[PDB]
Design a protein around this nucleic acid. Structure first.
Ligand SMILES: [Mg+2]
Ligand SMILES: [Mg+2]
Ligand SMILES: [Mg+2]
Ligand SMILES: [Mg+2]
Ligand SMILES: [Mg+2]
Ligand SMILES: [Mg+2]
Ligand SMILES: [Mg+2]
Ligand SMILES: [Mg+2]
Ligand SMILES: [Mg+2]
Ligand SMILES: [Mg+2]
Ligand SMILES: [Mg+2]
Ligand SMILES: [Mg+2]
Ligand SMILES: [Mg+2]
Ligand SMILES: [Mg+2]
Ligand SMILES: [Mg+2]
Ligand SMILES: [Mg+2]
Ligand SMILES: [Mg+2]
Ligand SMILES: [Mg+2]
Ligand SMILES: [Mg+2]
Ligand SMILES: [Mg+2]
Ligand SMILES: [Mg+2]
Ligand SMILES: [Mg+2]
Ligand SMILES: [Mg+2]
Ligand SMILES: [Mg+2]
Ligand SMILES: [Mg+2]
Ligand SMILES: [Mg+2]
Ligand SMILES: [Mg+2]
Ligand SMILES: [Mg+2]
Ligand SMILES: [Mg+2]
Ligand SMILES: [Mg+2]
Ligand SMILES: [Mg+2]
Ligand SMILES: [Mg+2]
Ligand SMILES: [Mg+2]
Ligand SMILES: [Mg+2]
Ligand SMILES: [Mg+2]
Ligand SMILES: [Mg+2]
Ligand SMILES: [Mg+2]
Ligand SMILES: [Mg+2]
Ligand SMILES: [Mg+2]
Ligand SMILES: [Mg+2]
Ligand SMILES: [Mg+2]
Ligand SMILES: [Mg+2]
Ligand SMILES: [Mg+2]
Ligand SMILES: [Mg+2]
Ligand SMILES: [Mg+2]
Ligand SMILES: [Mg+2]
Ligand SMILES: [Mg+2]
Ligand SMILES: [Mg+2]
Ligand SMILES: [Mg+2]
Ligand SMILES: [Mg+2]
Ligand SMILES: [Mg+2]
Ligand SMILES: [Mg+2]
Ligand SMILES: [Mg+2]
Ligand SMILES: [Mg+2]
Ligand SMILES: [Mg+2]
Ligand SMILES: [Mg+2]
Ligand SMILES: [Mg+2]
Ligand SMILES: [Mg+2]
Ligand SMILES: [Mg+2]
Ligand SMILES: [Mg+2]
Ligand SMILES: [Mg+2]
Ligand SMILES: [Mg+2]
Ligand SMILES: [Mg+2]
Ligand SMILES: [Mg+2]
Ligand SMILES: [Zn+2]
Lengths: 99, 83, 138, 208, 104, 124
RNA sequence: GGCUAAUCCCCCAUGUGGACCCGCCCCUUGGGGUGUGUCCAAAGGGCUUUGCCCGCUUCCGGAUGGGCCCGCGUCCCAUCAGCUAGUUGGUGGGGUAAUGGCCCACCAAGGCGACGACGGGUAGCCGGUCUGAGAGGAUGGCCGGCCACAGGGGCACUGAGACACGGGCCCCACUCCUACGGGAGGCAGCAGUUAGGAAUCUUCCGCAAUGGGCGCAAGCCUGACGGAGCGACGCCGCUUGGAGGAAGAAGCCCUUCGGGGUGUAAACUCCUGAACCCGGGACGAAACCCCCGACGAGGGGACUGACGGUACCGGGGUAAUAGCGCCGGCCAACUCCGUGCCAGCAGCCGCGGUAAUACGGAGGGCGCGAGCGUUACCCGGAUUCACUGGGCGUAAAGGGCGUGUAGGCGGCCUGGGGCGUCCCAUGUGAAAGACCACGGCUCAACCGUGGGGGAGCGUGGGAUACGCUCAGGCUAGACG
RNA sequence: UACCUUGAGGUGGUA
RNA sequence: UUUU
């Protein structure tokens, strides 16, 4: 028995737990940003989009997200924010959107 | 990683290889990418090694790492000479 | 209404010769005329001319036979021993130049219709084309 | 194995002299020489009209029973002859005439074909220098069939290559008696051979 | 090259989607007789531009959905239910040739 | 038929019916004799043929002939079947290979020995 | 619970560059460019220690591998005819590397079918293999490509890549351990066991060679592989002897009792000499590495074989396995005796009821020969599912008749298009196999190299007689 | 099992 | 009467 590959498993678990955590924030902030936008709170709705952006690319740094997966997220996010701010918004900090 | 190695084609005790380009992960005698030569280790004929420096040089120029033996054979056929 | 006019002509000819008629009429058509043009050149018929039967355009096909023979049944040998329709409505038959057949080790002919016109297997092969294998004749 | 056994009996069944003994088959004793009726308790009774089949069967036997080849090898050769270009019957005969054991016979190094065969399997023969012990070895044109020095001094080889002095040999061949060596000049042309076999019938035995 | 096919539009009943009946011809692999088979393609009509009876070209395209991988390249000839009819009648014939019998 | 009809129905390929449900399309099937006994020929023959009802391993129960001048089979004899019908005994479609299992070979058999499974006598 | 290193994780920075939103430009499905805004990098180690090696980060591209989609093709039953709700489509969203009812919410009511839907049966597909004159039939084992599966079912995690045979989780069945709470397993890897079966091998040698993973390298790992073992299972090669030898031994067989046969066969003489023995003894192996040269080119040097003491070479040397089927016709080979519709033979026709070339035996004969027969199965012959290539008055076969739907088929002349059809060029058609030639092993089987053909399909160009389509015309079909 | 009778059998007859 |  005993085939030291259980190691690969051990590691997978640590990695799993690391990815899991990273994605979780990305979601939380994304939602959060989407929420403030759908409320007209432009200055900070962007403020947070900026963080979400960072966290996404950052996740894509290693193998948590990686790929065009990162890009989709960034896309869909800016997509929903700029659009929701179509309620008088008027991008302030433009902390991410290029108007 | 594509390679330039030998492929077994003779018969029991009558080995005959084929210098060949292929993806490192394929069976040694499997689907190769291109044959770029042949080689008879027992030199049963005055023609026991042929290459095609032109093609060898193409693949080399695009990755293709050769086996030590293949590298050897390629060299012997003037693949790397520059003089 | 005729179903396959070329087959009709092929048959009218076949029949008429079995009773050794001098000539025999067939409703006219460019296409039928074109085939006749070959039957004549290849020397299977003494030739043909356009007549006007009862007001309509027909084609006298003058038939040809061998000479009177010895013993019983002195009927001449037929010049046209065989004439078969091949391609037919409801089973058209085409061939590439490479697929044009050779009728009786050459002793006969096959008439095919090509975009270079109605040719014999010799002519077809020469012009290097193929087409709808119309009929066989020997 | 290759038959081994009463041979001047095959001669009798085939009703013709097959030379499977060289000498004696010339003396007043080949049996075909006085006692021409087939072997066995029935050979003298009047024969019944043979079926076309019987003819070809007997005809194929005659031809094969001459070179001492096994039906197996005989068949394979004929198949090779068929597939090859040129008139099969011809090609077949030539191919048989190309067996080394046979050449060794045509050249006289040996009395009969069986004897010849043994001289080959026993290494007394050489081809272009290197010795060859394969009775079925096919000789190409230009090859030098010979005796190996180590064998040139054997009583049998002597009597044999001696009796060959002055004796002429097949036109598709050539022999240098003193050098105990000969050459396979050309595939014997059908006309060169004078076998008591109508090979057309053999081609037919294998068509059925 | 993205495949291009021609056919008649035999169904409008879908949003931004038309059913194009494409007829095909060819020699029977063993009997020679030139036979005629056909197949319906659900092509993408974004601006619901094409209607029943429209002979249209169909172009091989990126999946727009399931069962839908062609867009209408263009309009060949308009109006001509003679075709839609053949089709419709053939479908209606199926009518009851089951336990009873269709309609002739 | 017309070509169009052939295009529509085509020719029906010939199905081949086995004459030896020795199942598995095996060359031989083994079983055990349920019964052993004589049987009368048909058409114009007359005799007391030796047969056998065999409980087959192929899950079958069939009757098999016992070729030879004489045998040694009983209600519990293991046997190997080969398949070969006896033209005279309708119902018998298989033979029992002799020399295999409880089926001894044919004693004092001098000729067609390979059949009837009998070793070459030490004649001399 | 506590301590701790890093090429482990994180934050800030630099922004070649790249990602995302918006605009504009070129392109045209999400391709390429550009402007502002935002966001995003890194790891060190070794030294022949100021340089070089291994390596790290971001981006563009190459190469190889791959996902997804599409046209066409792919077995049997219609005694399966109707099927369908994520079901067909739409808008938005989720999801992924990516398109998509893939998934979801919402709306529409669609989608499929006799050109055979749906259901049932069977089955991995192919290059090819076998057969066949061909068309075709049958087949898919070895080898090569693709697919699928890893005790049965489901699931996701980690990763460039898996939904992962020798990773993980859960349920099920079974086995094992059990202090009864709970645990451990998964040979469809090599070999081997057992069970099933008519039937299918060694718990072998080696990592030397080719190939693979990791390592700068030495080198480690490799039941992949290279070899040996067992089985006539197949193919090919070889032997059991060669020459002489009586008008003819003996024995056995037949007999018109003269003789005939086995038979030159044996005996016997002479010759060669498979086995066996002695000696020698291999290619497959020259790279990696080290030295010189710049760790390059190039040159120099060293190590290394399981098979194997095997192949092969030389010397010596013994006459030294033959069997199986068949002999009524088809079908090549005949007589005696025994038996007496018995015992038995038998592929079909048939043979045996006191003369049996058909049963059993014997002599003899034919066939083939380390085989020969048998059984099973595939193609053939079988133009006996007929496309090539059949039929239907009485042989099997015209529907009891009509009307008519779909469909199949379509008179003469002209013109347009050029779908079918035909032509040229080009791409594709892997290797192996098959064919041809030459070559390596003494031959061959086996293998190496080279050559040639090739349907189908894609692309570009062309032809227009026939079929098709469109347009016009006609009157011989048809109808009035 | 035997003879009658069959070419040989079945039946049938005679022990 | 069965079989020739
Ligand atoms: Mg590790
Ligand atoms: Mg035809
Ligand atoms: Mg030939
Ligand atoms: Mg009888
Ligand atoms: Mg027998
Ligand atoms: Mg702790
Ligand atoms: Mg920048
Ligand atoms: Mg810049
Ligand atoms: Mg940063
Ligand atoms: Mg890192
Ligand atoms: Mg690529
Ligand atoms: Mg189905
Ligand atoms: Mg299956
Ligand atoms: Mg045939
Ligand atoms: Mg395979
Ligand atoms: Mg599973
Ligand atoms: Mg499981
Ligand atoms: Mg990885
Ligand atoms: Mg992942
Ligand atoms: Mg795994
Ligand atoms: Mg798994
Ligand atoms: Mg899987
Ligand atoms: Mg396992
Ligand atoms: Mg195993
Ligand atoms: Mg068992
Ligand atoms: Mg190794
Ligand atoms: Mg290696
Ligand atoms: Mg290990
Ligand atoms: Mg191996
Ligand atoms: Mg005697
Ligand atoms: Mg005698
Ligand atoms: Mg002798
Ligand atoms: Mg060497
Ligand atoms: Mg090494
Ligand atoms: Mg160097
Ligand atoms: Mg005979
Ligand atoms: Mg008899
Ligand atoms: Mg008798
Ligand atoms: Mg017989
Ligand atoms: Mg007998
Ligand atoms: Mg052999
Ligand atoms: Mg058959
Ligand atoms: Mg057939
Ligand atoms: Mg039949
Ligand atoms: Mg037909
Ligand atoms: Mg018939
Ligand atoms: Mg009747
Ligand atoms: Mg009838
Ligand atoms: Mg009627
Ligand atoms: Mg009737
Ligand atoms: Mg109609
Ligand atoms: Mg027309
Ligand atoms: Mg035109
Ligand atoms: Mg036209
Ligand atoms: Mg065209
Ligand atoms: Mg081509
Ligand atoms: Mg190929
Ligand atoms: Mg050679
Ligand atoms: Mg080749
Ligand atoms: Mg084109
Ligand atoms: Mg034109
Ligand atoms: Mg008109
Ligand atoms: Mg009696
Ligand atoms: Mg009887
Ligand atoms: Zn003789």
């Amino acid at each position: 028995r005993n085939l030291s590959a259980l190691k690969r498993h051990r590691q997978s678990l640590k990695r799993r737990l690391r990815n899991k955590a990273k994605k979780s924030a990305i979601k939380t902030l994304s939602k959060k940003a989407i929420q403030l936008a759908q409320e007209g709170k432009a200055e900070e709705a962007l403020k947070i989009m900026r963080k979400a952006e960072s966290l996404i690319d950052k996740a894509a740094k290693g193998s948590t997200l990686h790929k065009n997966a990162a890009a989709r997220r960034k896309s869909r996010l800016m997509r929903k924010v700029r659009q929701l701010l179509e309620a008088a918004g008027a991008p302030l900090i433009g902390g991410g959107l290029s108007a | 990683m594509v390679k330039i190695r030998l492929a077994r084609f003779g018969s029991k005790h009558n080995p005959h290889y084929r210098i060949v380009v292929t993806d490192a992960r394929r069976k040694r005698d499997g689907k190769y990418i291109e044959k770029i030569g042949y080689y008879d280790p027992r030199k049963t004929t005055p023609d026991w090694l042929k290459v095609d420096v032109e093609r060898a040089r193409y693949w080399l120029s695009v990755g293709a790492q050769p086996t030590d033996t293949a590298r050897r054979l390629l060299r012997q056929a003037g693949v790397f000479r520059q003089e | 209404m005729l179903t396959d006019p070329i087959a009709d002509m092929l048959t009218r000819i076949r029949n008429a010769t079995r009773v050794y008629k001098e000539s025999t009429d067939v409703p006219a058509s460019r296409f039928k005329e074109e085939i006749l043009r070959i039957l004549a050149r290849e020397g299977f018929i003494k030739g043909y001319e356009r007549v006007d039967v009862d007001g309509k355009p027909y084609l006298r096909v003058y038939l040809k036979y061998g000479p009177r023979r010895q013993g019983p049944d002195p009927r001449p040998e037929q010049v046209i021993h065989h004439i078969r329709r091949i391609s037919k409505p409801g089973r058209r038959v085409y061939v590439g130049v490479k697929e044009i057949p050779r009728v009786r080790r050459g002793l006969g002919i096959a008439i095919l219709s090509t975009s270079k016109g109605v040719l014999t297997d010799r002519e077809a092969r020469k012009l290097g084309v193929g087409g709808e294998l119309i009929c066989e004749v020997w | 194995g290759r038959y081994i056994g009463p041979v001047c009996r095959l001669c009798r069944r085939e009703g013709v002299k097959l030379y499977l003994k060289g000498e004696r088959c010339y003396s007043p004793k080949c049996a075909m020489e006085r006692r021409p009726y087939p072997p066995g308790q029935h050979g003298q009774k009047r024969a019944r009209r043979p079926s076309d089949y019987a003819v070809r069967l007997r005809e194929k036997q005659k031809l094969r029973r001459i070179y001492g080849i096994s039906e197996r090898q005989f068949r394979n050769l004929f198949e090779e002859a068929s597939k090859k270009k040129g008139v099969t019957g011809s090609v077949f005969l030539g191919l048989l005439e190309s067996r080394l054991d046979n050449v060794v016979y045509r050249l006289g190094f040996a009395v009969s074909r069986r004897q010849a065969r043994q001289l080959v399997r026993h290494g007394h023969i050489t081809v272009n220098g290197r010795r060859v012990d394969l009775p079925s070895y096919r000789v190409r044109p230009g090859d030098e069939i010979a005796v190996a020095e180590k064998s040139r001094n054997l009583e049998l080889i002597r009597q044999n290559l001696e009796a060959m002095k002055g004796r002429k040999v097949g036109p598709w061949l050539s022999l240098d008696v003193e050098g105990m060596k000969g050459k396979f000049l050309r595939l014997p042309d059908r006309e060169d051979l004078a076998l008591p076999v109508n090979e057309q019938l053999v081609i037919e035995f294998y068509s059925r | 090259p993205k495949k291009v096919l021609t056919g008649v539009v035999v169904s409008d009943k879908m949003q931004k989607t038309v059913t194009v009946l494409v007829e095909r011809q060819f020699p029977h692999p063993l009997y020679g007789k030139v036979i005629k088979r056909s197949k319906k393609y659900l092509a993408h009509d974004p601006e619901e531009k094409y209607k029943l009876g429209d002979v249209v070209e169909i172009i091989e395209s990126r999946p727009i959905s399931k069962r839908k991988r062609f867009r209408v390249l263009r309009l060949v000839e308009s109006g001509r239910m003679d075709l839609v009819e053949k089709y419709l009648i053939r479908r209606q014939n199926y009518q009851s040739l089951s336990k009873r019998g269709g309609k002739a | 038929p017309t070509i169009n009809q052939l295009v529509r129905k085509g020719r029906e390929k010939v199905r081949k019916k086995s004459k030896v449900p020795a199942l598995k399309g095996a060359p031989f099937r083994r079983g055990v004799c349920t019964v052993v006994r004589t049987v009368t020929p048909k058409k114009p023959n007359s005799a007391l043929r030796k047969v056998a009802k065999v409980r087959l391993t192929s899950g079958y129960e069939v009757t098999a002939y016992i070729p030879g001048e004489g045998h040694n089979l009983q209600e519990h004899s293991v046997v190997l079947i080969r398949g070969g019908r006896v033209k005279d005994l309708p119902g018998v479609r298989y033979h029992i290979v002799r020399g295999v299992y409880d089926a001894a070979g044919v004693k004092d058999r001098k000729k067609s020995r390979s059949k009837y499974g009998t070793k070459k006598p030490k004649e001399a």
